Design a protein around this ligand. Structure first.
Ligand SMILES: CN(C)CCCN1c2ccccc2Sc2ccc(Cl)cc21
Ligand SMILES: CN(C)CCCN1c2ccccc2Sc2ccc(Cl)cc21
Ligand SMILES: [Cl-]
Ligand SMILES: [Cl-]
Lengths: 155, 155
């Protein structure tokens, strides 16, 4: 939809925090176990330029660990998930050292996140997140406080 | 917190739609039966200047009807609910004919709504809602589409 020009994927490696989330549909986020309520722990680019995500997900009554690889495409900012469905991960913007904005898109519904490196509310990153979101048909948004950011599944 | 100057309460009577909702805590809105997921049907000012609300609420697996009176205070924009808890309704802004912004506050947690007269997405009213919200510690926001606005409990 809107993407990071000149993305250097190797430089997104490491720790991240899902500071804020937004989605096209309320049901994607408005339950503790909602489909898009997915918490990023780490991004692990592969030497071949795929992007592995370490995630948490509340499911069947607890906070489960998940590990998913999004495969590279010819566009550096766009990755594809191997599944029954054809979903994409799009990297909208990042400065590598503080924030990264991305969206998960199907083939439609959209969930986006504002990721930050540290458990702090970064108003500048959130401002960039909101600017990105005005071009998208979002209907739910939420953000987490520093206490929650240090808990499993942001409880 | 922030209020409508010169509110004429009699002029808020009639049909309204909860176009958007925001709250201080994610748990107040992030479930179909969450405490602040309350849908406004009608406002009925009394001759004595109290404000009755006709509402819907998803509870015990369906969309229940609710009727609550908020009693006047010496401030025209602030009403008080008779309960074990001391909660207030604050009217932030309205033009009577298109939109009304209000907040429910306890003694703390806050839920606010953008009400509109018709089942339409009013970007100007939502812009006013967002401006009001930047002065408040909100962590979840959602908005409804015209199809949902015509359904019981916005399903
Ligand atoms: C259940 N899980 C194993 C799948 C996670 C899918 N998923 C996802 C995929 C690849 C990289 C990052 C993410 S976060 C995310 C946020 C919103 C939505 Cl809707 C989906 C995702
Ligand atoms: C269960 N129900 C009978 C009580 C509704 C209480 N409540 C409320 C009260 C008076 C006038 C309007 C409202 S809407 C609302 C929005 C958010 C929250 Cl948190 C509370 C309320
Ligand atoms: Cl939104
Ligand atoms: Cl918000």
């Amino acid at each position: 939809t809107q993407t990071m020009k000149g993305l250097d994927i190797q430089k997104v490696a490491g720790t991240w925090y899902s500071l804020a989330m937004a989605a096209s549909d309320i049901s994607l986020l408005d339950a503790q176990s909602a489909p898009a309520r997915v918490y990023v722990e780490e991004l692990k680019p592969t030497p071949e330029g795929d992007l592995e995500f370490l995630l948490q997900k509340w499911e069947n009554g607890e906070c489960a660990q998940k590990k998913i690889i999004a495969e590279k495409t010819k566009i550096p900012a766009v990755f594809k998930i191997d599944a029954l469905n054809e979903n994409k991960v799009l990297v909208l913007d990042t400065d590598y050292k503080k924030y990264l904005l991305f969206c998960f898109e199907n083939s439609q519904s959209l969930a986006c996140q504002c990721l930050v490196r540290t458990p702090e509310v970064d108003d500048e990153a959130l401002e960039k997140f909101d600017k990105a979101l005005k071009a998208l048909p979002m209907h739910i948004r939420l953000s987490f406080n520093p206490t929650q950011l240090e808990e499993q599944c942001h409880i």
